[PDB]
Subunit: 429 residues, 4 copies
């Protein structure tokens, strides 16, 4: 089935085909002059996939308020349908990341719907940072590292349930992000809390299938405002190393202290074989969860420069999981996810253009200016023609958002789904 | 009316009276050796008040979740009852700051309940950062600075209504904090947005009584994650200077960029007569809204040092409004507000101990080391005995939290109020299907 | 000609074919977008940014300085090196002088300038360090020092800078001081600012009718607790207090972490106090790195505000543009060349923004298309425009490549003695 | 004695009465709290922190240096000044040396130290600056430099630092380098770290059985884009990779804004890699200000982890303590005196924490009472304990007051030639 009429896609592609041919041919000639085969780049670009977050498909909100748009998805099934659109138009998002219990539903049905939509499932995400109705033990003071044994046991059991759901739909990994921490000095004993967390994660690891990976995600702060158990990549490395070969670290771009050199963290985790994957998004102040590359596109390019360098250096067994983790508070979620996926492919494409041999020479000779200019020559290259052609060749849209709007999809689901009501956030009752 | 049994207060005071006498006399002797009359300090401390936020009386939450405790207040009336306790035990929070429409109710009933509880009302707070039921225009893309004229008018009208409610209950100021801004470069034109905001505020200003003040509150980010119209004190000054004499700037401690020297901003606003008031709280990362002084007590003291210096040298009827703006996500809201109000008095009392004459000398002398030590001599002084004695002499408790727990108040209201249910924040929408 | 014309000609010819192809390709793409590449190139070739005399020699940190070969011996060698930057990029006709570092006979400075085809931008005073024969030290401050005599000495220094500038063609004085405190209590914030305001008021009195006085804020360094002129808010208060000739200078690396610098630029423009810019890039503090080498988008967003100002018809808006960088690990001339290039690059992209479309997206609160409208301009590779602008004006298609081909560094290395002490 | 004993005696008697009143009052308050003030005083008397040889001279920034009077020149002058701090505070018996700045005949150094009653803490190598005659420059790095010969030179220097230390009684080598990049692409993050690890392994091999090797991480400066040993994570990787004798050194001012430093301390302790501390305070970057002058609670919170670690009986826990500060606007000796005082102040307050009560509030998730439990200790004015500890060990009740009364600064000013006066 096609969420977007194929005739609309065809029409909107033909409308822009001429210009694209001109832009692609021009870029091809320029790249050829630079000793690069544009065809080889396009080939790799059409193979780069990033998973879309189920929680980013509906309108997001802050602790102050939520302003839903029209046709908000009612649940996971509506979210999958909307994800199908993103994949149909960008062809870069074949897999969806589920979050439990937000996406709780019959696994068999989820798989059925996914297969029918041409969508797969990436890493499962557990939720022990919030309480569900009827929950026996509250996670107010923590979960996997809570002082109460019964509470830690409950959190561990929930994670095992996520794994069971994942095994039924085809997922091969579990991502664990918890809010565990403290808001006041002395509230928690840093070491004992970490010990409790490590012991609980060990139980999860014990129940982890041997064809699965366990990703732990660090975050400097929020919901905890004084200390956080898994606060940075250093603690994260200790966790992954301690748990086992199947445990790795997940890097969410917005979870670092101000001015942190994140691409270096990426390089370090790769060197020690603990880079499990990414949660892509952009930010300017905190964990803003904004559209990838919308704030600092060069940083995104520099992260991908480390990933490509890894391949260039000959690193093996390196297949990090790529996922988008964003919240869309003031835009049409589908459009933002479409362009964010595009931006990630944009950074990847530019990273592929780096003349590795030239860069290597300038680094060895300590020619800092030419070294940086070598990266800039790749980053300054407008690879949109490549991104658009990759989409066109694989069944997608030359201009995804334009086609999305021309299809009238949003108004369509707005009529099929109940209206929404704006409200406040979690700051007060 | 006494939320806390007088017999309990008296009992818990006598239980700690002997120790307090010893500590107070010891501190009194130490200060005397330092040329300071402890009684003069205690007298000023007893008179220092900070307003409590009604929205801080209930348990707070984040965008990820809310974990309510037992006996959660149902509405403004329950919250007023709970604030009565903070004031009874600390004697430092006689006034409550209201938020509309969260606390919207008959002004006569509000004023009536306040008088019965011995509570007054501080500045009103408007809410155009969220949508209410039946609202004609959404504030999703802004309010007072929204591109849509009808939306700006609705926001201005809401604020004018806040002034009306405030006039009826005894409030004398309106604090305006909005989320207006953008999440993406290009989404907003910085200049046009600010011009729209200034025009809208001008209309609100026209509705201010002669003895009222309009406080604009700056914030670097959140809910807007790229730009915010009223992002810092610089823009805040431009606003206040443009609007008029009744318009001043409100400084919320957790609303500044990392490493900002906040005490300097306070001094600058005082110098130009635009320091409207404060929203006290503490933080380490962003606008954490944590208990005042729980993270960086010295910073709080340094802010009060600027306030006391200005006071010491008599300045233009200088009377900034002191208010607490905190969210309590992992503690009993009443206990945190009690200790937060205590910390604010602690920093004030310590600031009063600074030898101003000596400090001035070291400053003109460029004796950096002795100047900083002059402040530290005051800051290092444990003034808890003064704070406790001030409370004891005015009908409060020597150890407020201890008395609060001994009274069993939380269990009491918990049995009177409906049970609450933990849930998520506004990060994602409902998902029942 | 610091760089032999035959070398510039040879290197341009070697790259002419590729430039032709890229420029024409870009031209057709822009035409399809409703933009006339010639109109953009005509504006770019006229965008100038002043080069800092103090950035022509190798810089250093408090830990060490690692000079390269042929370091300029003084201001005259520095002007000679600046002549290279201008000849190759054609984007830096003016130089920013710093007194007393560049103190010399005004007549001689001017003669070397005219001889090289260089002019002079804003003068820069120096009361953040002590010079020989100084009656009062600036250890504890300068224009805001508690000692009246010290403030007077600093005022006189600034007036001398104005006298030197008037003689060479300058039309402005930039004032950056380190005044502040390293400990709470050391300074009375308000009295320190009042002292500064009184001192600046005196300097303002020495300003010719057509001169400007720029005050530059900085969050910290050298002061590590408080700084008198710490941010744009205090800077605005200064400019507003002093008068029409007083404006604020924004140095990109002088703001708190995560600050929205482009908004500060917009705010100052709205109130007519944006005097000028000190361009550079950074990641941690006031790193003074090559412009756009770390965050090229931020640079573009700043220029987006500058071009919007013109779009909105702001009157008498002529900000001074200057580079303020230190080069510790590269050939200063090459970094200044590419930095000037980066600035013109961001400017050119700002010119490509479809302001009509953007205005529409802003009014309809279409956040996604509004940001995409900015990105459509920023993602455009304008290098062909920059290179064509240089070709037309006597510059080099590839400045650094032509610079290296000329062997200029090796030449001056043999002419200039390295300092031994 | 650098400071006449009769002066110390006179200034102690002058403040003896008030001290007695405050000590007895504090003694009674602590008694009511179940603590014996005598036990705390005994412990404080035994807490020592190393003073940096490079801290007794006046410091500066990249913009300027404003030396005071009696500036010590050379390690011998510096040792004489360090002796004053130890005599008056009795908290700094050991000095940290930096090579080549303090290079001198080991025998003479050891002899001067013994004569002044000073020992020697960890040695500090210097490959972040070039010494005259040096064969290879450290402009682009040292231990991680791309050039093999440069790395070997850096390694040899560190080995020489170990040789010097062994001769004077030192038992550890601290390695802090500026290695990194100022531009993206300039360095290959991974390869640079690999080179560093290989070089450090060579240094590790020259370590005596009873020696420790400390690596010090730093977010930035002198490198403004990336730094090889940028944070504690990389630092842990270095220590774990090198072996049991290698540990991480934590300098309070070397972390990203808002970093929770006390947590890093806890994590390093848990994994047995907390080698030591470089104490100082800051507000913006690596400001190197007097310990506790900006954020005293943070300092107390770091000590809370240290004291908890002992209370827990953690193995491999025996960190070194050193002050690493720069004094640009105060008398270096007075600042080091009060900084050592602040460090003992934080230690004393941490000792007052009711560990039993705290543990209970943590287990029951009583966050409010848990933090108030820490505050009860931190709010306690322990000055009487610090003062009595000094009085009892040959020091001064009020160190700075005695120092000033002694006229020491004027004394050395009359013995040492300033650049100009
Ligand atoms: C939804 C998801 O669990 C969540 O966003 C985490 O990955 C982390 O980014 C939270 O800040
Ligand atoms: C509830 C109140 O309006 C709010 O807290 C504001 O004062 C401001 O702090 C928001 O960040
Ligand atoms: C050299 C020049 O005065 C200086 O760079 C100032 O402009 C300012 O950037 C200092 O941080
Ligand atoms: C002088 C000493 O080696 C130096 O201060 C290092 O320890 C580190 O702090 C540098 O930033
Ligand atoms: Mn995430
Ligand atoms: Mn997140
Ligand atoms: Mn507030
Ligand atoms: Mn707030
Ligand atoms: Mn500058
Ligand atoms: Mn600067
Ligand atoms: Mn150090
Ligand atoms: Mn340092």
């Amino acid at each position: 089935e096609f969420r977007i009429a194929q005739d609309v896609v065809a029409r909107e592609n033909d409308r822009r085909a001429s210009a694209l041919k001109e832009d692609y041919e021009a870029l091809g000639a320029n790249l050829a002059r630079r000793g690069v085969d544009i065809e080889a780049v396009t080939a790799k670009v059409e193979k780069f996939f990033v998973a879309v977050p189920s929680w980013g498909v509906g309108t997001g909100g802050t602790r102050f308020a939520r302003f839903p748009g029209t046709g908000e998805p009612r649940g996971i099934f509506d979210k999958l349908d909307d994800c199908a659109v993103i994949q149909q138009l960008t062809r870069a998002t074949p897999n969806v990341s589920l979050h439990i219990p937000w996406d709780k539903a019959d696994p068999k049905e989820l798989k059925a719907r996914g297969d029918a939509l041409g969508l797969g499932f990436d890493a499962m995400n557990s939720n022990t940072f919030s309480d569900a109705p009827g929950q026996a033990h509250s996670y107010k003071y923590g979960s996997l590292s809570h002082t109460n044994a019964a509470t830690r046991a409950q959190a561990v059991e929930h994670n095992l349930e996520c794994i069971e759901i994942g095994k039924a739909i085809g997922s091969k990994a579990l991502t664990v992000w918890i809010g565990d921490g403290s808001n006041f000095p002395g509230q928690s004993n840093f070491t004992r809390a970490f010990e409790r967390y490590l012991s609980a994660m060990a139980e999860i690891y014990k129940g982890l299938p041997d064809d699965w990976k366990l990703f732990s995600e660090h975050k400097m702060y929020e919901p905890a405002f004084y200390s956080t158990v898994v606060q940075d990549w250093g603690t994260n490395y200790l966790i992954a190393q301690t748990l086992g070969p199947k445990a790795q670290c997940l890097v969410d771009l917005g979870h670092h202290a101000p001015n942190t050199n994140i691409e270096m963290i990426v390089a370090r985790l790769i060197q020690f074989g603990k880079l499990g994957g990414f949660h892509f998004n952009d930010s300017k102040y905190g964990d803003d969860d904004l559209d990838a590359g919308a704030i600092e596109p060069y940083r995104l390019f520099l992260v991908f420069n480390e990933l490509v360098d890894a391949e260039a250096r000959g690193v093996k067994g390196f297949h990090p999981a790529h996922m988008i983790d964003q919240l869309h508070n003031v835009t049409d979620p589908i459009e933002s996810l479409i362009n964010s996926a595009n931006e990630i492919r944009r950074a990847y494409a530019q990273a592929l253009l780096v003349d590795r041999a030239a860069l290597s020479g300038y680094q060895e000779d300590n020619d800092a200016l030419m070294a940086t200019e070598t990266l800039k020559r790749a980053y300054r290259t407008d690879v949109e023609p490549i991104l658009a052609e990759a989409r066109r060749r694989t069944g997608g849209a030359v201009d995804p958002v334009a086609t999305y709007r021309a299809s009238g999809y949003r108004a369509r689901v707005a009529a099929e789904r109940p209206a929404s009501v704006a409200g406040g956030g979690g700051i007060i009752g």
